[PDB]
Paper text:
Parkin is an auto-inhibited ubiquitin E3 ligase activated by dual phosphorylation of its ubiquitin-like (Ubl) domain and ubiquitin by the PINK1 kinase. Parkin is an autoinhibited RBR family E3 ubiquitin ligase consisting of an N-terminal ubiquitin-like (Ubl) domain followed by four Zn2+ binding domains RING0, RING1, in-between-RING (IBR), and RING2. Like other RBR-family E3 ligases, Parkin binds to an E2, and ubiquitin is transferred from E2 onto the catalytic C431 residue (on RING2) of Parkin before ubiquitination of lysines on target substrates.
To further confirm, we crystallized the phospho-Parkin (3C, TEV)-pUb complex after treatment with 3C protease. Treatment with 3C led to displacement of the pUbl-linker (1-140) from the Parkin core (141-465). The crystal structure showed RING2 bound to RING0, which confirmed that RING2 was only transiently displaced from the RING0 domain in phospho-Parkin and returned to its original position after removal of pUbl-linker, further confirming our SEC data. The crystal structure also revealed that the REP element was bound to the RING1, similar to the autoinhibited state of Parkin. Phospho-ubiquitin was bound to the basic patch between RING0 and RING1 domains, which led to conformational changes in IBR and helix (connecting RING1-IBR domains). In the asymmetric unit, two molecules of Parkin bound to pUb were seen; however, in one of the Parkin molecules, no density was observed in the IBR region. Overall, this data suggested that pUbl and RING2 exist in a dynamic state in phospho-Parkin (pUbl binding<->RING2 open<->pUbl displaced<->RING2 closed), and compete for binding on RING0.
Author numbering:
A (entry chain C): 139 to 353, 356 to 378, 393 to 405, 413 to 425, 427 to 465
B (entry chain D): 1 to 73
The structure:
């Protein structure tokens, strides 16, 4: 049968309201039907995230479709065809048995940062990392990305791109992150929030204007100084270094086929094809069985 | 699907959208309800000001997720 190993994790909103293992699915990007026959199965995450990146031929005669669309669903309940969960692509099963950079324990699953060393942190530590940082307003605001965090180790060029990873905050803290991000967005834009208590309504005034009226009738509505934040006046204002080494995601070769028993791996693509002509079998590298639906859904590829 | 547009006042508006809806469409939908011209609307999600020519799916904005509205004067 197909092993119950999974490589893909999503966030279920209902009813799991937590991070669960995910199912990978595919379709013709044109007909939105399950008719796309992939040229080569996905090997990296880039394949299942970057659109129109994977090519094939839609088997419907009506489609001119040549591109594959990848969606993810939960792996814990009967999922309707409509119930797509956001795939958190930094989370991976710790098959390699690496150490949370913060907590120096082998845990699974873990989040691998896109820092140059491909650092690994476990979800629990990552949680604490986000909780401290968020409330300490030490979340980065790149106007081109949004509110995010880099490598815990402070590695450069590591800012988390998929901002849905911050659902690891939990619903209360995530909702705050949504607020905190919007707040910080206005401030760093040079905009202001209402100084009046119970308002907090974000405003983007004229670039050079000290007089800001908080004003459909949806305003404060109150006028203030863009400087001292008073009623507008014509007057004057008033990580362990060692644990970072042992927490790198890169710190099996060939196996014989279950039939022709000749040694065969294509990147991370777990879909193997026996090269011998009297064999020509499709087999899973992990499960070990004949390439099937569950294997596709659980771990088409591995990290 | 349905999304919530929350102003920092706490003011929440309920909108009927689809993943294919562009931010431009979303803003027009807000104008249809509240009456705020799209020209005065600045929508933020995940702490990024959302661009008009991107769809909710592009921003991975999920069913019953929450957008933020900030006004330009
Ligand atoms: Zn679930
Ligand atoms: Zn098609
Ligand atoms: Zn940990
Ligand atoms: Zn790092
Ligand atoms: Zn106000
Ligand atoms: Zn002043
Ligand atoms: Zn064989
Ligand atoms: Zn398998």
């Amino acid at each position: 049968g197909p092993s119950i190993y999974n490589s893909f994790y999503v966030y279920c909103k209902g009813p799991c309201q937590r991070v669960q293992p995910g199912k990978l699915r595919v379709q013709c990007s044109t007909c939105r039907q399950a008719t796309l026959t992939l040229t080569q199965g996905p090997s990296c995450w880039d394949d299942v995230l970057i659109p129109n990146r994977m090519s094939g031929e839609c088997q419907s005669p009506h489609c001119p479709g040549t591109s594959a669309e990848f969606f993810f669903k939960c792996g814990a309940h009967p999922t309707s065809d409509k119930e797509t969960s956001v795939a958190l692509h930094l989370i991976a099963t710790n098959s390699r048995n690496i150490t949370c950079i913060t907590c120096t324990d082998v845990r699974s699953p873990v989040l691998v940062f896109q820092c140059n060393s491909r650092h690994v942190i476990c979800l629990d530590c990552f949680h604490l990392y986000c909780v401290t940082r968020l409330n300490d307003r030490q979340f980065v605001h790149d106007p081109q990305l949004g509110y995010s965090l880099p490598c815990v180790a402070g590695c450069p060029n590591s800012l988390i791109k998929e901002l849905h990873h911050f659902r690891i905050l939990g619903e209360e803290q995530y909702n705050r992150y949504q607020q905190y991000g919007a707040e910080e967005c206005v401030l760093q834009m040079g905009g202001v929030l209402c100084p009046r208590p119970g308002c907090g309504a974000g405003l983007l005034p004229e670039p050079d204007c000290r007089k800001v009226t908080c004003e459909n009738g949806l305003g404060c509505g109150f006028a203030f100084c863009r400087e001292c934040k008073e009623a507008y006046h014509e007057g004057e204002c008033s990580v362990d270094e060692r644990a970072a080494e042992q927490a790198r995601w890169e710190a099996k070769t060939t196996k014989p086929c279950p039939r022709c028993h000749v040694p065969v791996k294509n990147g991370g693509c777990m879909h193997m094809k026996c090269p011998q002509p009297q064999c020509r079998l499709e087999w899973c590298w992990n499960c070990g069985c004949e390439w099937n639906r569950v294997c596709m859904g659980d771990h088409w590829f591995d990290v | 699907m349905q999304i919530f547009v929350k102003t920092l006042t706490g003011k929440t508006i309920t909108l009927e959208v689809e993943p294919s809806d562009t931010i431009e469409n979303v803003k027009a939908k807000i104008q249809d309800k509240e009456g705020i011209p799209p020209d005065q609307q600045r929508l933020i999600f995940a702490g990024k000001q959302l661009e008009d020519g991107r769809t909710l799916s592009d921003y991975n904005i999920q069913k019953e997720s929450t957008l933020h509205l900030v006004l330009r004067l």
